[PDB]
Amino acid sequence: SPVIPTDPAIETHIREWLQKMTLEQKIGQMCEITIDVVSDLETSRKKGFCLSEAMLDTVIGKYKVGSLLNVPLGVAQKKEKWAEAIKQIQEKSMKEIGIPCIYGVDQIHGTTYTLDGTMFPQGINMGATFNRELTRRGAKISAYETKAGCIPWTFAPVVDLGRDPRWARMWENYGEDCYVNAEMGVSAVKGFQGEDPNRIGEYNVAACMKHYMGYGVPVSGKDRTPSSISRSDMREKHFAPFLAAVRQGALSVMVNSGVDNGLPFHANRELLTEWLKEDLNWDGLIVTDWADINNLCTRDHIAATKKEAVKIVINAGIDMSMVPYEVSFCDYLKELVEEGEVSMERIDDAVARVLRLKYRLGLFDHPYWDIKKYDKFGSKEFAAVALQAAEESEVLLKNDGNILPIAKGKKILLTGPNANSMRCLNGGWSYSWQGHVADEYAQAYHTIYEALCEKYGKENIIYEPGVTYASYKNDNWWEENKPETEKPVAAAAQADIIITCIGENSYCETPGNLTDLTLSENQRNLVKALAATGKPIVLVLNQGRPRIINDIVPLAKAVVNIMLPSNYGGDALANLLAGDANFSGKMPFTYPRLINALATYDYKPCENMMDIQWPFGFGLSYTNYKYSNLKVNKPTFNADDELIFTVDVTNTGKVAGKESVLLFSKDLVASSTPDNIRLRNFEKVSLEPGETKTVTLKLKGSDLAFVGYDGKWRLEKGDFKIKCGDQWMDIVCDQTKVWNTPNKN
Ligand SMILES: OC[C@H]1O[C@@H](O)[C@H](O)[C@@H](O)[C@@H]1O
Ligand SMILES: [Mg+2]
């Protein structure tokens, strides 16, 4: 049955577009071109962003191109500028084609490419909140502020499995667990789109699930190099968030640029047409990632010509090509259709999907609109939500002697290269693609230094970085200036405590590839030199990947992992360090300790017959929580039962906080060697000092199924254990079920 209901009025409109459209118009609707192609750059340098009328005439008038993407001039623009540009684009599209353009933008964590928007912590941070509602509210705000520039389509959310800490895109998704990505991805989709996928309202956008699928586990750790994914992992884990999002009505999917089992995913008919469109009966849009049809020819050599690559990818089930420079795509596809290599059935289906999306977004009736009414843009109300997200994502990993919180009045030596910059805090997909320009445009927001000054007074903060990042040149995200560790060491005698901010500078995608996961040698020497002053040290980790720090964690009294908390991350940190907020974040991935002992939390028991830095689900706070009375309604169950778990959680310390309650399962014996432990549900609860609450968490029996060797889901007769916080119970499945459908439920 269709995952998104059929709107007959939309289908009727589509049928009558398809009867009347020229082949050139149809092909144009399957083509997407990046904004640079239609930009007048010399006039833009002098007078601000300006489109080229002549190039619009070519792209839209002659070739009938149905979609544009990307940020004008490679840098975030004012919403007024966005709106003026999209207006001109739509006036042209309605005049020459009669079909409105769909403009896609990478608004990744709030409005990446719209100035003065509300910027949220990155995906990995949102995972660490274990707060679905907060993720939803973040996406709702991003949608609102995206539509404030007349943009209807966001290339988000990202639901790759961040299971490889070498990978430059580990931070874009919600971490290493497939359940966390599925649930948060669904929360983002609901926020972005609203509750009716057929009528995306004024303040909502179409979501795009990225990057279908298995993108996050390249064998070498290098971006867009081959993964080697097992049959069971592909169905059970990598597919899981896409399955969940599509069933909630996500309107579009972007395909994985990379390769597995010798096949680029853009050429994988089975995964695109069968697993996605046909098995789920899903009428949404599949779009390529950047240049990926041409990559079949030039990068991977599975096509002799670009034209042969078009044939392969379109026949594999792609609907729209992110070319993104060459209107010649249209010529090639037309030739293929005339030759009989690509059928009209396939062209008509692609165009149906493009038009359907456009109708769902109301673009025929409202191709652009007045933006005056979007008066909550950049508001205090929206910022308080981003601040909450940031507070809830920053993880307390170590606190010996309860050195935190730090009392107002103590003198703080602030050190390290991540201590005074918004570029660090944001990472990539922030004002520019690499994030390199963040400090030019993020002056209204607080760096770590600025926030600590507001909390403790400028007079109580001594800032001597010792090590700083070099100025931007050719994606030198790794490069630091010569260390001057001599300086903060000398200044230490005047401080009570040292906070050292370390990790990475901003990068995005392939330029962010690393050759050594170990934290920078200069950064490690800075921490060692400071340790030897005898003053206590608090490490602040600000990075897109968990850099190896096994030699410096023993020298630190406390450690806070902020990951990429973005524009309110400095404020959040200061609020947490002073106890005005209480820590609640938990690790959404496994932090490795040794460079050739990398592992995820759901390892097979042969892997621990297990030496890591901090595990998945770990996080401290300024209070403690007791779990008791773990019960279930049906201790003996089958696939079709609803299991209802309850547990009492009591705040036994002296201050209020939020506890993320995680529910894990363990299959003791199975026909495939079972994951040692698996997250199955979670729920976050607020508790005052001394307060108990009964937390309810529900599962279907079939949630304890796994994908067997033969590719089929099975729930087997036998024993399981359930772990919730500190507490364990026994349950029994009383009968085996094997599914003949590709998916459960
Ligand atoms: O910018 C459009 C697309 O281009 C590619 O570089 C990235 O992999 C995608 O995440 C992005 O949505
Ligand atoms: Mg079993």
Author numbering: 26 to 634, 647 to 782
What does the paper say about this structure?
In this context, we recently reported the characterization of a novel xyloglucan utilization locus (XyGUL) that confers Bacteroides ovatus, and species harbouring syntenic XyGULs, with the ability to utilize this abundant vegetable polysaccharide across sampled human populations. Here, we present the three-dimensional structures of BoGH31, BoGH43A, BoGH43B and BoGH3B, expanding our knowledge of the structural determinants required for xyloglucan degradation. Our analyses highlight key adaptations in these enzymes that confer their specificity for xyloglucan oligosaccharides, while also providing a rationale for the maintenance of two divergent genes coding for GH3 enzymes, and similarly two divergent genes for GH43 family members, within the same PUL. While we were unable to determine a structure for BoGH3A, our structural and sequence analysis of BoGH3B has also allowed us to highlight further potential differences between these two enzymes encoded by the operon. Together with existing biochemical data, our analyses of the three-dimensional structures, and various enzyme-inhibitor complexes, of BoGH31, BoGH43A, BoGH43B and BoGH3B provide molecular-level insight into the stepwise breakdown of xyloglucan by the BoXyGUL.
Like GH43, there are two GH3 members (BoGH3A and BoGH3B) present in the Bo XyGUL, both of which have been shown to be β-glucosidases with very similar specific activities. BoGH3B comprises a three-domain architecture, consisting of an N-terminal (TIM) barrel-like domain (residues 26 to 419), a central α/β sandwich domain (residues 420 to 660) and a fibronectin type-III (FN-III)-like domain at the C-terminus (residues 661–782). The dimeric organization of this novel enzyme appears potentially important for function, with a large, flexible loop reaching over from one protomer to contact the substrate and fully assemble the active site of the neighbouring molecule. BoGH3B was found to co-purify with glucose in its active site. This could readily be modelled with a 4C1 chair conformation, highlighting the position of the −1 sub-site. Away from the −1 sub-site, the exterior surface structure of the GH3B active pocket deviates from the most closely related homologues, presenting as a more closed structure similar to that seen in the distantly related barley β-glucosidase. GH3B has significant activity for glucose-only oligosaccharides but displays far weaker activity on xyloglucan-derived oligos, which retain their xylose side chains. Similar to barley β-glucosidase, such observations might suggest that the narrowing of the active site cleft could be responsible for the high specificity of BoGH3B towards β-1,4-linked glucans.
